[PDB]
Amino acid sequence: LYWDDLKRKLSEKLDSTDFTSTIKLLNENSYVPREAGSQKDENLALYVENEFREFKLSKVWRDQHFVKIQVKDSAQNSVIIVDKNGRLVYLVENPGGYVAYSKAATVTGKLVHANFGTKKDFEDLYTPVNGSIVIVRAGKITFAEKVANAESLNAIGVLIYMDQTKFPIVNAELSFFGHAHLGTGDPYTPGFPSFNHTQFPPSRSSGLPNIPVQTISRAAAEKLFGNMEGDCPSDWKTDSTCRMVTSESKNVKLTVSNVLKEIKILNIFGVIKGFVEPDHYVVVGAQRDAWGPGAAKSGVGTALLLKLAQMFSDMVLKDGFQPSRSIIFASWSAGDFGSVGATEWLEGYLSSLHLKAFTYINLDKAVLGTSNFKVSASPLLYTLIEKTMQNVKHPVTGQFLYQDSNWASKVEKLTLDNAAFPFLAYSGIPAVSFCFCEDTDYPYLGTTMDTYKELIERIPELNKVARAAAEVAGQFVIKLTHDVELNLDYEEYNSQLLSFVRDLNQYRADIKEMGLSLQWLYSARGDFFRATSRLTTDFGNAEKTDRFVMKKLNDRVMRVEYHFLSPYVSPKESPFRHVFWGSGSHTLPALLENLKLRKQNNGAFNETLFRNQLALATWTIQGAANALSGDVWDIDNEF
Amino acid sequence: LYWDDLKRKLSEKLDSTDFTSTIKLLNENSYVPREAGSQKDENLALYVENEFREFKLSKVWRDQHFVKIQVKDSAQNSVIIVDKNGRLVYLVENPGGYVAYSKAATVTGKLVHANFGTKKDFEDLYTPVNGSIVIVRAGKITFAEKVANAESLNAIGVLIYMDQTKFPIVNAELSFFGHAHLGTGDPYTPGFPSFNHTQFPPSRSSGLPNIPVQTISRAAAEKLFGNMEGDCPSDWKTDSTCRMVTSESKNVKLTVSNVLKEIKILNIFGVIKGFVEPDHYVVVGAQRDAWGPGAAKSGVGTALLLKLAQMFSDMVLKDGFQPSRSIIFASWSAGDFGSVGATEWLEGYLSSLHLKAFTYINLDKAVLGTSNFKVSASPLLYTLIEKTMQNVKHPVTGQFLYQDSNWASKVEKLTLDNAAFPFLAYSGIPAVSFCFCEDTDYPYLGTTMDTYKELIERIPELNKVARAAAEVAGQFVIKLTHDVELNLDYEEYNSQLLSFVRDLNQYRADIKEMGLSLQWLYSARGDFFRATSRLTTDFGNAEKTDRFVMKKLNDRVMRVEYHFLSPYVSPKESPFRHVFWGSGSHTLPALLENLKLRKQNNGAFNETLFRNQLALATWTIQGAANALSGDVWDIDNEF
Numbered sequence A, B: 001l002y003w004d005d006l007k008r009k010l011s012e013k014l015d016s017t018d019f020t021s022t023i024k025l026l027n028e029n030s031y032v033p034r035e036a037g038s039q040k041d042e043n044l045a046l047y048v049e050n051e052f053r054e055f056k057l058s059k060v061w062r063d064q065h066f067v068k069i070q071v072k073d074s075a076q077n078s079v080i081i082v083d084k085n086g087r088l089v090y091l092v093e094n095p096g097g098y099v100a101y102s103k104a105a106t107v108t109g110k111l112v113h114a115n116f117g118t119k120k121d122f123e124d125l126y127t128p129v130n131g132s133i134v135i136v137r138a139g140k141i142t143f144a145e146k147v148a149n150a151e152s153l154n155a156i157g158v159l160i161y162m163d164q165t166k167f168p169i170v171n172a173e174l175s176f177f178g179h180a181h182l183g184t185g186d187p188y189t190p191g192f193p194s195f196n197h198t199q200f201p202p203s204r205s206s207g208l209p210n211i212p213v214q215t216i217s218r219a220a221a222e223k224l225f226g227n228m229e230g231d232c233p234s235d236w237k238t239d240s241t242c243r244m245v246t247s248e249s250k251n252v253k254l255t256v257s258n259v260l261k262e263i264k265i266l267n268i269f270g271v272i273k274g275f276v277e278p279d280h281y282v283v284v285g286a287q288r289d290a291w292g293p294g295a296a297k298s299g300v301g302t303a304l305l306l307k308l309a310q311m312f313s314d315m316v317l318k319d320g321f322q323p324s325r326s327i328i329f330a331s332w333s334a335g336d337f338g339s340v341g342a343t344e345w346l347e348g349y350l351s352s353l354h355l356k357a358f359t360y361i362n363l364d365k366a367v368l369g370t371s372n373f374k375v376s377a378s379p380l381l382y383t384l385i386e387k388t389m390q391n392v393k394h395p396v397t398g399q400f401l402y403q404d405s406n407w408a409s410k411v412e413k414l415t416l417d418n419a420a421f422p423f424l425a426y427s428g429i430p431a432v433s434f435c436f437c438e439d440t441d442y443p444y445l446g447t448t449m450d451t452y453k454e455l456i457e458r459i460p461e462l463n464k465v466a467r468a469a470a471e472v473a474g475q476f477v478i479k480l481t482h483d484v485e486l487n488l489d490y491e492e493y494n495s496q497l498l499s500f501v502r503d504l505n506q507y508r509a510d511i512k513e514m515g516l517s518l519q520w521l522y523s524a525r526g527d528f529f530r531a532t533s534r535l536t537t538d539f540g541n542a543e544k545t546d547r548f549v550m551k552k553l554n555d556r557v558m559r560v561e562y563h564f565l566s567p568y569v570s571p572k573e574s575p576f577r578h579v580f581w582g583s584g585s586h587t588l589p590a591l592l593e594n595l596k597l598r599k600q601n602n603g604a605f606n607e608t609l610f611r612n613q614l615a616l617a618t619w620t621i622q623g624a625a626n627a628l629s630g631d632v633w634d635i636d637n638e639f
């Protein structure tokens, strides 16, 4: 069949699927407080597993894992205002929720208020946090980062609250759940999978806080500010009530007693074997666990995952759809702790997944509103996101998703808190991640209020919306399979690479003071450009009939993304090796970020570090080229 | 054509080729002291380059490189006996040769004599080297290692001489050339290629001595012993004359002044495009540089390389030979310093070469005698070495190379000093390396005596011998290409892996004292066995006509070797990642080697180190499995 056919079919199928029901079903007490590794968790897990079986799809299995999660100890965690001795006022509060992987300790001192988790940026404010507890708003960044920065400035203890402006929740006595791990997955099995506790049981600090972090209710925040002299700025796009520093007269004490708890995570798979490249998959995932009932955090996703798997299987058996490449749906678990489920899976194919999975879609938090349509992905999926937003019509507005007034659409970078991030920054798999987002992030998100009710009370046509999300997700799959040519934008990296070279040339001056020639970089950038130009040519000259010549090409395409992961850094040390989207000194952005410091004439600039950064970052790109063809044995022997 | 045809043809072609002439030609003053990066060097380089062109073979190019080599400074290096002052005795000797990368310094003190470069083993002798110069024989190990151990025991300065028993050279006034780098290639570009000196110019110590090392003439050795009280043991399979320690009355002073010198290495290639898998090569290399005239060290090799390239091209054009996979001959340079030429080439395709080269043959030191026939290679080429030694008849003896009295032949491990080692231990390419060796290693090897004369004076039928070597080398190539199925023994690794498990079970006791379950390892070993069993099956069921299904299989085979390189260690830190043949704590052998120390009840055993060693070494094997198939998504979801 042809695209129109698949597009049309997939639509009517989407026209007759109740997503709202399943989003509700995944709310019955049968599986409501489906915490990570809980019974409910395991309940829904088997539900999905069976549903897949019922869907009559091909092979479907389970993925067991034992990771260390952190939970609230029997001893109560609390915040209390107290002078250089005893609590005068009252125990601010005994927080109802907590920040996982938080340093298990208790300390007291001054209490500064660095708007939006310091943002790392905001830390450049007047009052110093040099040895004092800090308050921050839940927002622009992730707790992990908020805390990380706080501690990088030598602070201790961090409180996170949901202000009124950012979080318009009527109830101010509401508490939410946190993360705190500056990474992805179990924080003791970096790059390699985990085992028992009995075996390989290190404690922590392997990329974990080392500073107590506690989530606080707005109400509690109110009271804290009540005992603070300083006055909150207008710079902070907030609203009155907060201070900046506690009234000297007295300080505050934070006490968090949390304990590690080995649980058994259960990932559930299920594929749909392809017909020509049966061994090249399109991983479609969806977080299944959640702290509260997580109708949004986990409902909509799993809801889509199921309904979406139900369709393709059907299409394959009844409608004649013959996906040239297999599809593999996966419902991860222990996701509230950093995609621990999906990550440790990847951890499992540390150097082969890219040979198998060529793209990872992600349905998490797919429906959160009806205004915007945020989209984050690897440039390799740029044109797919585009052309698809040109085929899918907004659920509310009768118009298409794509803003016809531009030629350059907006695509966001994947964040440390998105299961898709690991797939791309660690496993080198290109990944997309859409969201029918809103200017303001869903409030009830990390709290017990993520109910199917308060959701649909806030998004009336949730069905139509989820449908759309299920449609863009569907087309991605049809598209990434329908045709024999693996359609990934390996060109977009030329641009991505040129942009770097450009930004780097703004320091040609600094580059000159240092003996650096910066010539080898251009060569790489070019040696790579050709590589793509050949591939982009060889394709055109090859016939969509020679299963062999095509397979040889598609494989080259399939290498592109993975090969941009620094082959000079160990996964065990720095898991996000992707020079473009990773995190670490190997990061391309990180290079400029160090060089910028050169001008500051201070010591902030580590020259030896740069020298290497450039040196390697060059050979990384270079290699990416020699790997992406050049007909092998690239013959630019001159230079 | 069929094997017999190719075998028969290749033979008569070998029957009519004067190898002796070319081994001589490569001795004319036109290119005699062809040191690394010298003019002569560059001369022969262009000779080979043109010869290849003349051979009318397909593409042929050059490979430029700027590595830092070490050379003898204008200031003379010398050894002189002297007391706590007053430099008594005659100027023992101003050594004619030198040990590259040796620490540039000068020191004096006691002089111990640790037979055969300490061997690391021999260091367990009576007299301590704790702060004193040391003497060693050139033998069992490499200078690099000899020195390394010496310094690990806190010694300073090391002299290397060629004793009479081991080196039956009439002339005792003869001096030889050394190495000293405990690695492979330029010692400042570990894992990543080099640049200019102007750019990235670190000094050294990046895996280099830090202790002066000087080669000494037997004559000089004589004199040293002359001023020594101790008496040489019979344990040392040597002969009279040497002592153990200098006569207390006085000591010796070593002064080495060498300087680094950026040179331009020139690797010369030339391929023979295949007909079905044109992009899967069989790298056939041969060191081209040398200190002395190196007729053996470099002549015979380059001699074969040329003559061997001359044949296949001819066979392809005239005889109808249609290699299903391309052949690529390569004459490296700067090889006397650690395969610096070939290594930095590999350094170039840090993560893709295995996707290109599926086997590396090596002609270096192919002819050195006529008695034995040593052979070193990766178990993946075991059956080829075997079946071939069953087809090639010894040049002297009319009988076949293969000892018919066994079913299990002897194959040696690749050493740090073999261009093939890097290909296998660093790039993950299976590599063979034969030698018509002798019980005693060629004496003139590292000295100005490696002449075509003294050679043929010591091996009369050098032509027939070289011919044989050129024949086993030839069949390897014909065999690795003739057929459509990539013939590599990926099975032999099951054995190789089981042997490990076995040897490891001898410590099940220790493994038990520690909470270790050691169960995950068996699973991997097994999860891998199945993998090979499927591949070994899929092949049988596939037809040598479906270029597609075969390509998909051969590729899997082509992954086998590379995937045993610890994906948890950085090439920049530990370049030889191969868990089996590499070097480092990631090494499989290294694991046992640490565990053995457990019993010693002392602290020598690092438990935390083991814990990881096992942990990762497990996932390494595991991964090797998940990468070698299991039909993708290995479904041993239970466990």
Ligand SMILES: *[C@@H]1O[C@H](CO)[C@@H](O)[C@H](O)[C@H]1NC(C)=O
Pocket: A130, A131
């Ligand atoms: C850091 O903060 C402490 C108070 O905790 C203060 O005494 C000190 O002056 C600040 N700066 C330094 C360098 O210690």
Ligand SMILES: *[C@@H]1O[C@H](CO)[C@@H](O)[C@H](O)[C@H]1NC(C)=O
Pocket: A066, A195, A196, A197, A198, B517, B519, B639
């Ligand atoms: C992992 O630990 C759990 C509980 O400690 C146990 O049930 C399970 O059998 C262990 N798995 C292995 C492979 O030892």
Ligand SMILES: *[C@@H]1O[C@H](CO)[C@@H](O)[C@H](O)[C@H]1NC(C)=O
Pocket: A606, A607, A608, A609
């Ligand atoms: C500078 O970077 C090099 C290499 O990354 C490192 O060895 C050194 O400790 C760093 N120095 C500082 C001040 O960061």
Ligand SMILES: *[C@@H]1O[C@H](CO)[C@@H](O)[C@H](O)[C@H]1NC(C)=O
Pocket: B130, B131
């Ligand atoms: C090491 O050698 C020195 C002589 O250089 C000697 O004085 C000392 O006793 C030896 N052992 C130690 C532990 O220093």
Ligand SMILES: *[C@@H]1O[C@H](CO)[C@@H](O)[C@H](O)[C@H]1NC(C)=O
Pocket: A517, A519, A639, B066, B195, B196, B197, B198
């Ligand atoms: C490398 O250095 C040599 C001599 O310093 C010079 O001839 C050559 O052009 C340099 N190469 C580059 C790329 O700068």
Ligand SMILES: *[C@@H]1O[C@H](CO)[C@@H](O)[C@H](O)[C@H]1NC(C)=O
Pocket: B606, B607, B608, B609
């Ligand atoms: C033991 O090994 C661990 C990890 O390899 C290392 O951190 C530690 O320093 C080692 N200790 C000793 C005494 O070797």
Ligand SMILES: [Sm+3]
Pocket: A185, A186, A187, A188, A189, A190, A191, A192, A193, A194, A344, A347
């Ligand atoms: Sm982990």
Ligand SMILES: [Sm+3]
Pocket: A454, A457
């Ligand atoms: Sm309401």
Ligand SMILES: [Sm+3]
Pocket: A523, A527, A634, A636, A637, A639
């Ligand atoms: Sm180039």
Ligand SMILES: [Sm+3]
Pocket: B185, B186, B187, B188, B189, B190, B191, B192, B193, B194, B344, B347
């Ligand atoms: Sm190097």
Ligand SMILES: [Sm+3]
Pocket: B457
């Ligand atoms: Sm003679």
Ligand SMILES: [Sm+3]
Pocket: B523, B524, B527, B634, B636, B637, B639
């Ligand atoms: Sm298994």
